[PDB]
Amino acid sequence: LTVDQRRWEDLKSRLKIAQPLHLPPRPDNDGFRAKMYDITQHPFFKRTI
Amino acid sequence: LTEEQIAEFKEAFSLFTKELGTVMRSLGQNPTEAELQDMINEVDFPEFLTMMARKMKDEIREAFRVFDKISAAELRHVMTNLGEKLTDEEVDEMIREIDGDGQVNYEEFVQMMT
Amino acid sequence: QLLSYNDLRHFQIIWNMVDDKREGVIPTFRVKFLLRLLRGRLEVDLDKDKLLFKHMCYEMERLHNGGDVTFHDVLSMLSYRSVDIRKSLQLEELLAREQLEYTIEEEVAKQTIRMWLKKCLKRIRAKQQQSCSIIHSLR
Amino acid sequence: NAVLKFHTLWRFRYQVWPRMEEGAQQIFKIPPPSINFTLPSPVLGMPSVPMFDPPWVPQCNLQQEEEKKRLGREASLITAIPITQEACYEPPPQAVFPACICAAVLPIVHLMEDGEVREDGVAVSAVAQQVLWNCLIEDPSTVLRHFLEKLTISNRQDELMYMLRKLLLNIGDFPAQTSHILFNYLVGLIMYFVRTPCEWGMDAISATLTFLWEVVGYVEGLFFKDLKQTMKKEQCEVKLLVTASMPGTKTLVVHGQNECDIPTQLPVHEDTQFEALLKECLEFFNIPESQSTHYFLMDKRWNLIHYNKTYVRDIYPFRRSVSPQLNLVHMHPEKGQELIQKQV
């Protein structure tokens, strides 16, 4: 196999492994949970954690 | 946003009962202001899409990019295989309906569309 | 030259934005609402790629006849169409893919023609049925 | 001299336009060559066989090399190719060979059987054969198009097949290109007659088939798979291959004596003959048993009178959206029997 073919096969395998993101949508009925989701997903929060 | 609804509605229900008319007017349409609530009764991006896509559902480029071949027999068999419950009665008329060269130009066919 | 993780992450975000639930399947008519919302390296230009976008929509409508389509199907489709298949596929798979795309293209072309066919058939059926009513009167 | 003059006209046909006014194609009009045939796509056979080691193409353990080269060079028929046309360099030219000169081919074919010898030892048949061979190897299309197109406009298939057979037997061969184009054209004609209704369509098909098997012996790369796929794509494999499977029409529609009268939509199974269909037609149309031997089912479009004991699914293999239209026509039993005999 050429390198391009090998990479294609690897990509196929990866996409097989890939699954839908688990993160649910941000609730919007109540501002409480809204701000909670907004602050939680902020990248700096993860970095500091 | 854009002329086509998909990239419009991420903004039209994120950037903004009456103000979304300023978006609707981009289509050239000015429906009754109360109907702006009728759409907002869908509150939801995919529901808005499923409503208005079929509202908008309710030209020559395509013709020139489908003429990828058309002899008389070619048209005859292509259309008869493609077509619905025709009875091979119209097709004598289609082969006979302007130059009579055995060739069709789809620009004139689109003209005779309506 | 290949679909990366940034592209996959963006596609996942768009999927979770067009798929309201976490069911992992969408009715095929929703498929376009994926392809045209997809941005960045995977974006398609509606003002230059109309044929290609229509081809993709019909392909993901044929994969299961009017069926609901999974995340993996659309992801495989974008993968195939985002690579120079002649370089990155085996011979038999390259032939299969190219014959599939050929079939899709001619199928969608005549699927466009069928609408004109339907309209003209309507007109001529109306005319001939009124002529058959006349002949019935002649009875 | 007539034969030689024909040859000269042939060899000078590309040098007419240059001799007269510049841009005279617009001011002088020659009607285009009418061609109603759509040859099978892809082309059925190999258009030509390459020379093994052409001394006029510039590109290109030893002793083996020479041996192989010699053996391959012996196998190749240098006299079957237009040497000077292949050997010319490739860097448009239009040919003016009107349809009334192509008719001269047939008299030349006849002359190929003329044994008379001139006082210089030249025989008419030898020069005729040389001229025809050179034309056929150079351009079969220009020399056969007239006949092929003429057949469409008139019912003279028998004459065409007789001429082609005489040509084959007198020349004793068809070089690969001649047979390639001939076969493709014949198949195209067959499919054309299959599609377009015609009074002498099936007769033409029969005539063509009576001779096709002689041409098929000279096609070099004709394989079963390719033929099958091409014919299937053209939807006319039944008329060519006995090993063709096609689900026949599920139902049939038959019209009565009067015009626009209520037809009948009858079913068609895998083992139904026209006899039961005709019996149902008689029962539906209230025809007395005394006058029951004068009515026959016939296809006006294709001009076919149906035999009682021939299966329906065989005559209408196509399972399209449109059911075949038949007619219950009344006529004298003797004439109906004669027509049935002829068609069978």
Swiss-Prot record, chain B:
Which Gene Ontology cellular-component terms appear in the entry?
calcium channel complex; calyx of Held; catalytic complex; centrosome; cytoplasm; cytosol; extracellular region; myelin sheath
On this chain, the residues bearing N6,N6,N6-trimethyllysine are: K85
In terms of Gene3D superfamilies, this protein maps to: EF-hand
Q: Tell me yes or no: is Phosphoprotein among this UniProt entry's keywords.
A: yes
| One GO MF term | protein serine/threonine kinase activator activity
- Please tell me where Ca(2+) 3 binds in this chain: D68, E74
Briefly state the protein's biological role.
Calmodulin acts as part of a calcium signal transduction pathway by mediating the control of a large number of enzymes, ion channels, aquaporins and other proteins through calcium-binding. Calcium-binding is required for the activation of calmodulin. Among the enzymes to be stimulated by the calmodulin-calcium complex are a number of protein kinases, such as myosin light-chain kinases and calmodulin-dependent protein kinase type II (CaMK2), and phosphatases.
Q: Any extra detail in the entry?
A: This protein has four functional calcium-binding sites.
UniProt name for this protein: Calmodulin-1
Organism lineage reads as: Eukaryota, Metazoa, Chordata, Craniata, Vertebrata
Point out the gene that encodes the protein: CALM1
From Swiss-Prot, chain C:
What does the UniProt record tell us about how this protein is modified after translation?
Phosphorylated on tyrosine residues.
Q: What is known of its domains?
A: Contains 24 transmembrane helices (TM) that form four homologous functional repeats connected by intracellular linkers. Each of the four internal repeats contains five hydrophobic transmembrane segments (S1, S2, S3, S5, S6) and one positively charged transmembrane segment (S4). S4 segments represent the voltage-sensor. S4 transmembrane segments lack some of the charged residues (K and R) found at every third position in the S4s of the NaV, CaV, and KV channels.
Report where the shown chain sits in the full-length sequence: first residue, last residue, total length.
Answer: 1460 to 1598 of 1738
Location in the cell reads: Cell membrane
Name this polypeptide is given = Sodium leak channel NALCN
Q: Which disease is it linked to?
A: Hypotonia, infantile, with psychomotor retardation and characteristic facies 1: A neurodegenerative disease characterized by variable degrees of hypotonia, speech impairment, intellectual disability, pyramidal signs, subtle facial dysmorphism, and chronic constipation. Some patients manifest neuroaxonal dystrophy, optic atrophy, unmyelinated axons and spheroid bodies in tissue biopsies. Congenital contractures of the limbs and face, hypotonia, and developmental delay: A disease characterized by congenital contractures of the limbs and face, resulting in characteristic facial features, abnormal tone, most commonly manifested as hypotonia, and variable degrees of developmental delay.
Subunit note: Found in a complex with NALCN, UNC79, UNC80 and NACL1; these auxiliary subunits are indispensable for the function of NALCN channel. Interacts with UNC80; required for the NALCN activation/inhibition by GPCRs in neurons. Found in a complex with NALCN, UNC79 and UNC80; UNC80 bridges NALCN to UNC79. Interacts with CHRM3.
Return the similarity comment. Belongs to the NALCN family.
- Look up and give the organism this protein is from: Homo sapiens
Curated annotation (Swiss-Prot), chain D:
The disease this record links to the protein is: Hypotonia, infantile, with psychomotor retardation and characteristic facies 2: An autosomal recessive, neurodegenerative disease characterized by severe truncal hypotonia since birth or early infancy, progressive peripheral spasticity, and profound psychomotor developmental delay. Some patients may have seizures.
**Protein name, entry field:** Protein unc-80 homolog
Tell me its family: Belongs to the unc-80 family.
The lineage, from the top, is:
Eukaryota, Metazoa, Chordata, Craniata, Vertebrata
Disulfide bond sites:
none
**Where does tissue-level expression of this protein occur?**
Moderately expressed in fetal brain, spinal cord, skeletal muscle, thymus, spleen, fetal liver, small intestine, colon, kidney and uterus. Highly expressed in adrenal gland, prostate and testis, as well as in brain and cerebellum.
Coiled-coil segments = none
In its record, the post-translational modification comment is:
Phosphorylated on tyrosine residues.
Identify the domain of life: Eukaryota
What range of the full-length protein does this chain span?
1643 to 2090 of 3258
Function, in words:
Auxiliary subunit of the NALCN sodium channel complex, a voltage-gated ion channel responsible for the resting Na(+) permeability that controls neuronal excitability. Activated by neuropeptides substance P, neurotensin, and extracellular Ca(2+) that regulates neuronal excitability by controlling the sizes of NALCN-dependent sodium-leak current. UNC80 is essential for NALCN sensitivity to extracellular Ca(2+).
